[PDB]
Design a protein around this ligand. Structure first.
Ligand SMILES: Nc1ncn(Cc2cc(-c3ccco3)on2)c2ncnc1-2
Length: 167
């Protein structure tokens, strides 16, 4: 039994809700919140900009030190950093950005990072400003993630389309 509330159950392990991931993170304090990161951990907009804003820029400060030490992530890769005031940990996951020409096949690799964590609060990878079709992203999620994932979908109109079209 966990503290996530009001989710619709899509499969054995995938749940979905119309929610602001920032607000859901602050209420739940999940062990892991997933950030829709880029390889430079520059959290300027979309989910990443919102999560970082909610940390009063502490996420960005930590991320800049991470990059200075380790260099950029790979597209499809991830790193675990602090969750600050939002979660115990933040799993920064880089889905392919269609608006940069990155290969969509890397979306499966990106979701594989979730399998290293038993329970996660997450957005749909590569959705929003990353330019992929969120229906495709949901399908890859369901077909790749085996651990328990609670998906937050900010847009109510999109949430309803994802549910209604789910196979
Ligand atoms: N605070 C947040 N900001 C951004 N996203 C990503 C996102 C946005 C959309 C979309 C579709 C039409 C308009 O926006 O689809 N995915 C978030 N997901 C959960 N919380 C989020």
């Amino acid at each position: 039994v966990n503290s996530f509330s009001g989710y619709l159950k899509l499969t054995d392990n995938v749940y979905i809700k119309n929610a602001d991931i920032v607000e859901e993170a602050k209420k739940v304090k999940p062990t892991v919140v997933v950030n829709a990161a880029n390889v430079y951990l520059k959290h300027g907009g979309g989910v990443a900009g919102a999560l970082n804003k909610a940390t009063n820029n502490a996420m960005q400060v930590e991320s800049d030190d991470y990059i200075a030490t380790n260099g950029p992530l790979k597209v499809g890769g991830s790193c675990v950093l602090s969750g600050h005031n939002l979660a115990k940990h933040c799993l920064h996951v880089v889905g392919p950005n269609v608006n940069k020409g990155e290969d969509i096949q890397l979306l499966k690799s990106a979701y594989e990072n979730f399998n290293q964590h038993e329970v996660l609060l997450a957005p749909l990878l590569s959705a929003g400003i990353f330019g992929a079709d969120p229906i495709h992203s949901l399908r890859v999620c369901v077909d790749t993630v085996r651990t328990n994932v609670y998906l937050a979908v900010f847009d109510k109109n999109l949430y309803d389309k994802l549910v209604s079209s789910f196979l």
